C-alpha cells in the first residue's frame, strides 16, 4: 500500500519548510556524541526519528535536512526512511492506532478488536478518519503476546483489550484525555490472572547466596 518512490507534490517537496527547533538542535548534539568520532552517520536513525516527533511525519525536506546535518548523501537517508516501518512518509492522524494481528494475538481474537475500531471510527484498515484524528493499520508482534489483543497508540500499549474496552479508549482519546496505558482486565503486567503462581515470598536481600570466594 505504501509506495517507495517519491513524486513531488505541493505538500511534499524539497521546498516544504522544515527545520529543527533550537531545542532539538541541542538534543541532536547529544545524540551525535553517543558515537565514535568519524561515525556521525550512526545518528541517522535517532535524528530522523527526532524529526518525526517534532513534525509528526517525514517530508522529503525533513530527510534532506538530516542528510546535511550529519553530512551523509541524501539517498542514504531515503534508504533508512523507506526500510523502517515506524517512519511515516505520509501524514498520519495525531492518534496512530496500531492493532497487532500476528498469530498469538490472532488466536485471542484480535479480529474482534479490529472490527470494533472500524465500526466505531467508520474507517477501513490503512485509512485516516475525515478529521485528521485517527489512522488505523495492522502491525506485527509488538512484544506483548502474553497479553490478550493489544494495540499501540503513538507510544502507549493498551493490553488485554475487548471490543468494549477498545471503544472506551477511542472515546477517552476523542474528547481530551490520554487513557492509562497497560492491561484493561484487572491485571497489571504479564502476571497470571487469577493469582500469582510464583514470587510470593519476600525477596532475599543483599548478600544472599553469595559464594565464599567472591
Partner 1 sequence: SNLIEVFVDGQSVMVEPGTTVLQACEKVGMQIPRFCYHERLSVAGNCRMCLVEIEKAPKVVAACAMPVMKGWNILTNSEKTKKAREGVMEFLLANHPLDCPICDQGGECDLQDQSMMFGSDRSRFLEGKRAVEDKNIGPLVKTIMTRCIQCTRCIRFASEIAGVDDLGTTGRGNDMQVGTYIEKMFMSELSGNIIDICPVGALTSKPYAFTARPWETRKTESIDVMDAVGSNIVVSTRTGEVMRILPRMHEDINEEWISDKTR
Partner 2 sequence: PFDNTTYKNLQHHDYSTYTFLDLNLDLSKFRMPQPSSGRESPRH
Partner 3 sequence: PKKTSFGSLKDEDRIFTNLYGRHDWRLKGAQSRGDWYKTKEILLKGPDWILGEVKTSGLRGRGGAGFPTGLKWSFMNKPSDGRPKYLVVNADEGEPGTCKDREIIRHDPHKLVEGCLVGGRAMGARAAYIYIRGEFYNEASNLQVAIREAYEAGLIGKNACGSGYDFDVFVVRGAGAYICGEETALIESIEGKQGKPRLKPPFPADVGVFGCPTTVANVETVAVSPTICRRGGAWFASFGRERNSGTKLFNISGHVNNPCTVEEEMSVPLKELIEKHAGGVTGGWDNLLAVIPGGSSTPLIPKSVCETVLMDFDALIQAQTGLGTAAVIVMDRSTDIVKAIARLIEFYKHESCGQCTPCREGVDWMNKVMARFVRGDARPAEIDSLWEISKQIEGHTICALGDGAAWPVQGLIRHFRPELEERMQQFAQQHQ
DSSP letter at 41 equals G
59 phi/psi in degrees, rounded to 5: -75, 170
CB under 8 A, 24+ apart: contacts of 164-169: 166/113, 166/116, 166/117, 167/116, 167/117, 167/120
CA–centroid distance for 212 within its chain: 47
- Binding of partner 2 by 84 (CB under 8 A): no
CB of 29 to partner 2, least distance (A): 8
2 forms part of the interface with partner 3 (CB under 8 A)? no
Contact between 172 and partner 1 (CB under 8 A)? no
**How many residues bind ligand FES, per CB under 6 A?**
10
CB of 16 to partner 1, least distance (A): 13
* Residue 194 in the binding site for partner 2 (CB under 8 A): no
* Contact assessment for residue 100 and residue 142, using Cβ atoms and an 8 Å cutoff: yes
Here the cell at position 51 is 524529526
The contact mask relative to partner 2 for 11-50 (x = CB under 8 A, - = no) is ---------------xx--xx-xxxxxxxxx----x---x
Binding segment (CB under 6 A) for ligand FES, from list 33-41, 72-80, 141-149, 178-186 = 141-149
Rg (CA), the chain: 22
Alpha helices by DSSP H, 56-162: 60-70, 74-83, 103-107, 110-121
Residues that bind partner 3 (CB under 8 A): 34-36, 39, 41-46, 48-49, 70, 72, 76, 79-80, 83-87, 101-104, 106-108, 140-148, 152, 155-157, 181, 188-194, 196-201, 203-211, 213-214
Residues that bind ligand FES (CB under 6 A): 100, 102, 104-105, 141-145, 150
Amino acid at each position: 500500500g505504501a509506495l517507495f518512490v517519491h513524486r513531488d507534490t505541493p505538500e511534499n517537496n524539497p521546498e516544504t519548510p522544515f527545520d529543527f527547533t533550537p531545542e532539538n538542535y541541542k538534543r541532536i548534539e547529544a545524540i551525535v556524541k553517543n558515537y565514535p568520532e568519524g561515525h556521525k552517520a550512526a545518528a541517522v536513525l535517532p535524528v530522523l526519528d527526532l524529526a518525526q516527533r517534532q513534525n509528526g511525519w517525514l517530508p522529503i525536506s525533513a530527510m534532506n535536512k538530516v542528510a546535511e546535518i550529519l553530512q551523509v548523501p541524501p539517498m542514504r537517508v531515503y534508504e533508512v526512511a523507506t526500510f523502517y516501518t515506524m517512519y511515516n512518509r505520509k501524514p498520519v492522524g495525531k492518534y496512530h492506532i496500531q492493532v497487532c494481528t500476528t498469530t498469538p494475538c490472532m488466536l485471542r481474537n484480535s479480529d474482534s478488536i479490529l472490527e470494533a475500531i472500524q465500526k466505531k471510527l467508520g474507517i477501513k484498515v490503512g485509512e485516516t478518519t475525515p478529521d485528521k484524528l485517527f489512522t488505523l493499520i495492522e502491525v506485527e508482534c509488538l512484544g506483548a503476546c502474553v497479553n490478550a489483543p493489544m494495540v499501540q497508540i503513538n507510544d502507549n500499549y493498551y493490553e488485554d483489550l475487548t471490543p468494549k474496552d477498545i471503544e472506551e479508549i477511542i472515546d477517552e482519546l476523542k474528547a481530551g484525555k490520554i487513557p492509562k496505558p497497560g492491561p484493561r482486565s484487572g491485571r497489571f503486567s504479564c502476571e497470571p490472572a487469577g493469582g500469582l503462581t510464583s514470587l510470593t515470598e519476600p525477596p532475599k536481600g543483599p548478600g544472599f547466596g553469595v559464594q565464599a570466594g567472591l
